[PDB]
Amino acid sequence: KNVVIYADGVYDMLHLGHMKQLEQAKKLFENTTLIVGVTSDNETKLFKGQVVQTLEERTETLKHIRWVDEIISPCPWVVTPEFLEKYKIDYVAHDDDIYAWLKRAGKFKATQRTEGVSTTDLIVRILKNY
């Protein structure tokens, strides 16, 4: 009955958007274990771009989030089938094609982003009144 959900990401400057996505992942089934994977500094810079917080800082914030049950930090940049077997993962949860193989296998669960809620946008809210 317990379903293992894997949600990976950078989780830089964690904000309400991240938190709601993690809540969604956690609640995909009645009884879950939500494993969160946190990408390495080098790979994030190489493949995505600038990261503000270090891996250690990004991982630390996630320890305080209600929905997070387990953490893999650093996690691999690319999810593989071998990874799913290694950690006994039933579904990968991510915003929604690098995930076509997961959809084909029945192992992809879409989660949604929330706009306008990022730490970034809140400094813009301050500077807009300044």
The residue ranges that bind a copy of itself (CB under 8 A) are 13, 16, 19-20, 22-23, 52-53, 57, 60-61, 63-68, 119, 122-123, 125-126
Question: What minimum distance in Å lies between the beta carbon of 29 and a copy of itself?
Answer: 19
Instruction: Check whether 64 is labelled as a binding-site residue.
Output: no
Non-local CB neighbours of 17 within 8 Å, separated by 6+ positions:
113, 114, 115, 117, 118
Distance CA 82, CA 126 (A): 46
Question: What minimum distance in Å lies between the beta carbon of 125 and a copy of itself?
Answer: 7
User: Hey, what are 127's tokens?
Assistant: 């500077």
Distances (CA, A) of 114 to 18, 25, 97: 8, 14, 21
Asked whether the beta carbons of 36 and 11 are under 8 A apart, the reply is: yes
Q: Which is nearer to a copy of itself, 61 or 103 (CB)?
A: 61
Instruction: Check whether 121 is labelled as a binding-site residue.
Output: no
Instruction: Check whether 10 is labelled as a binding-site residue.
Output: yes
Instruction: Check whether 48 is labelled as a binding-site residue.
Output: yes
Q: Which is nearer to a copy of itself, 27 or 88 (CB)?
A: 27
User: Hey, what are 14's tokens?
Assistant: 């964690």
Binding residues: 10-11, 18, 48, 95, 114
